[PDB]
Design a protein around this ligand. Structure first.
Ligand code: HEM
Ligand code: HEM
Ligand code: V5D
Ligand code: V5D
Ligand code: CL
Ligand code: CL
Ligand code: GD
Ligand code: GD
Ligand code: GD
Ligand code: ZN
Lengths: 401, 401
């Protein structure tokens, strides 16, 4: 059992939960690949068995009446149909566990508070769009955001998958410019080109909300525009740099990842978008300051009258800090939920202690948990972590085009 | 079997073929990644043959003349004595490779410029002290720092080791109190207590340079006071915050690690202090601002009149950036070599590119290469890395008690 030290305090724990790691990661004794972004009924049966055991553990009913019945029921259904169906309560438990198990998520202190929308009856792309609009409306909640996931029908033989082609429900377009540059968000150039290819009339702003490409089984994707009043946005201003408003920057309230696969007990849900609320560094540091994103850092530093000709003035650090200040200030001003990296990392430390007592460990990806500014100022920097894969899980999947 | 390595800022892809050469096994398995953890008779000929092979290919002399000749004398030396002596060029070459191979060092663009002092004929704590004093004065060079390593005698059976008991050549004292808490450097507390326990006269202050505890083979260690004119220190002040200097903060010029074990061609040098020059975040961010180190972040924020009542004011980030500004400013004002984390990381990217051409890859520890402030503002944040152990190497080693 790996020993895990906290260097700020001297605390030591052992991660016995990693021993239960089923699926394997990319590291070996030869070489660590931890920093890489992207690392048969009988095997269906073992994953289902393990999940049913997890569920009956959670309802304090392991080895009971209901428990063995469900095990036999699932087996019989796998033998008879090649697959099986989750009960509603098992689905809710599985979606929360998938969040709880996600090693790159710093917000997991919230894992138990997740609104699960059961869309497993969804029949079409048009119904899919309706469900998604209701997810966005519920989750946004006029700025008082609520964690939620909508679960569309599982993958099954004989039918194609439900897929949301967009990587998030709200994304800004990225238009390859006249002179080779990108207007808008360069992360979204491909999906922008897919929307235009599918009949979307593009805009030419920097913050144009993209339409949804929604794929029903064995159907080409269909284009659906989000009603503007559903997509809550926050104009960015700075509490003391009044010229900051003139940059014309905005961001959207609702982070809703829509391209990941949800796995529960061997069943796969290729379409199960989930949403929380932002941590300010995601917007202020990554989305706005990455050289390959909006890349505003030099423009801000220049307007701040910093000396950008030498790196040792720390003009980059100073401009990034104020961009994060602006993000927090603007979201608070707009009354839209947001958490800063200090509050977020501190609550993740409480999560780790909770999980050590609950399960004997917690899978965590240090490189993703530690925030992208002010790393060692947060408590998670000084916390060793063990990364491993537990199921139920959220997993990357290939793009459907 | 050749790990694909992507840079996410630029889109570029490489393959680490060097990873195939990994000798010692890391802590990672396919079921769990332990990359974030700080600390995870004729087999001598195997690592000796291998090292001699490296040396001769590096001078473009594989399979010719002195190579086979030198292959035989090491064979003869081990058959006749159970070990062997390195030629001076090999000791030099091996020292540079251990540096080049250190996966946690962001300064390795400098690896080819290293001054190697050969103390293999050393034999007494008094003899070491003069060596360590040559080094320090050579390395410091009146503030124009030069990289350097002194190699004390290798380890042999039947005889105790040369060991430097301090973790660095320069360390500030840490004194416990009538109430537990520490005046000075909390990280050194323990060696401070050993130094006193061997007859040192403890000062009272927050920046008392500790004496050296030098251990000759099979002897208790002797205390050695360093000449105060030999230990170059930098009083910390801030370009525009005139009160910063009044906080009385200082740091020393020479970072010289003195507790690691140099391994070359199966040979083990438990006393081999190496020194470079500081990256400003090592002092400004970790040494001064870690909660378990000098922990000055709050004192600076009070002086800056910052709103320390709410985390979302980012007062910690603001205070931290100014402390790093102070470090860079003070070191430059004193003309003591220092490198900021932007310059340092940009040079490492250049090092990765060189190493890709030269050896086909580079073992790199993402968690230690990315700086502790402004992580994603530096290019190494967006660079995938492969971590693995190559030899020659610097390795951690137990404390000699
Ligand atoms: C409630 C507030 C939440 C916060 C503050 C939060 C925060 C974060 C952050 C900062 C990341 C890293 C993103 C990046 O750097 O690219 C992340 C990743 C992730 N989060 Fe959370 N999250 C929240 C809610 C949720 C919910 C509700 C779910 C699912 C039910 C979830 C699942 C995940 C997953 C799967 C990842 C990994 C994404 C990837 O690998 O690309 N999070 N989260
Ligand atoms: C010349 C300028 C140099 C710079 C700017 C530099 C910078 C750094 C930094 C920032 C670290 C991270 C340590 C930490 O975060 O506590 C590090 C680690 C390390 N450096 Fe370098 N270094 C330099 C020279 C050298 C030299 C000359 C050697 C050996 C010959 C060396 C070998 C190492 C090793 C082995 C580590 C890992 C130490 C550990 O794990 O504690 N470095 N360096
Ligand atoms: N509030 C909330 C609530 C719910 C969910 C989320 C997460 C938003 C997730 C968006 N997923 C974007 C993404 C995916 C893959 C790679 C990305 O960038 C590449 C990259 C390269 C190197 C890295 C090194 C360290 C590190 N930590 N990240 C890296 C990312 C972005 N947020
Ligand atoms: N200029 C230069 C030049 C040459 C050499 C150096 C290195 C200075 C070494 C001082 N240090 C050594 C050390 C050893 C072990 C632990 C340490 O700290 C604890 C800790 C815990 C978690 C971490 C997670 C990530 C990360 N990056 N570091 C961590 C450090 C320090 N410097
Ligand atoms: Cl985002
Ligand atoms: Cl240091
Ligand atoms: Gd102003
Ligand atoms: Gd402008
Ligand atoms: Gd004042
Ligand atoms: Zn690993």
């Amino acid at each position: 059992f790996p020993r895990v030290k906290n260097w700020e305090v001297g605390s030591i724990t052992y991660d016995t939960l990693s021993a239960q790691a089923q699926q394997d990661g990319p590291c070996t004794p030869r070489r660590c690949l931890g920093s890489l972004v992207f690392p048969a009924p009988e095997q269906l049966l073992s994953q289902a068995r393990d999940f049913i055991n997890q569920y009956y553990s959670s309802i304090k009913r392991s080895g009971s009446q209901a428990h063995e019945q469900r095990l036999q029921e699932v087996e019989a259904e796998v033998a008879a149909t090649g697959t099986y169906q989750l009960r509603e309560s098992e689905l809710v438990f599985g979606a929360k566990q998938a969040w709880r198990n996600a090693p790159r998520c710093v917000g997991r202190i919230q894992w138990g508070k997740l609104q699960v929308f059961d869309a497993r009856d969804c029949r079409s792309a048009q119904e899919m769009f309706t469900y998604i609009c209701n997810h966005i409306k519920y989750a946004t909640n006029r700025g008082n955001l609520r964690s939620a996931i909508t679960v569309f029908p599982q993958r099954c033989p004989g039918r194609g998958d439900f897929r949301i082609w967009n990587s998030q429900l709200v994304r800004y377009a990225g238009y390859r410019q006249q002179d080779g540059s990108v207007r808008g968000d360069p992360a979204n150039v491909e999906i922008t080109e897919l929307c235009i290819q599918h009949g979307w009339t593009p805009g030419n702003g920097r913050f144009d909300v993209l339409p949804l490409l929604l794929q029903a089984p064995d159907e080409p994707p269909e284009l659906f525009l989000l009603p503007p009043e559903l997509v809550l946005e926050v104009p960015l201003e700075h509490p003391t740099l009044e010229w900051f408003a003139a940059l014309g920057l905005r961001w959207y309230a609702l982070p809703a990842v829509s391209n990941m696969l949800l796995e529960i007990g061997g069943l796969e849900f290729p379409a199960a978008p989930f949403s929380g609320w932002y941590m300010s560094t995601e917007i202020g540091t990554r989305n706005l300051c990455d050289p390959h994103r909006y890349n505003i850092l030099e423009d801000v530093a220049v307007c701040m009258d910093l000396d950008t000709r030498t790196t040792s003035s720390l003009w980059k650090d100073k401009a990034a800090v104020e961009i994060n200040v602006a993000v927090l200030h603007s979201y608070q001003l707009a009354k839209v939920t947001i958490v800063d990296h200090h509050a977020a990392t501190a609550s993740f430390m409480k999560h780790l202690e909770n999980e050590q007592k609950a399960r004997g460990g917690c899978p965590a990806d240090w490189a993703w948990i530690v925030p992208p500014i002010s790393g060692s100022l947060t408590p998670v920097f000084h916390q060793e972590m063990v990364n491993y894969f537990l199921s139920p899980a959220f997993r990357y999947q290939p793009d459907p085009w």
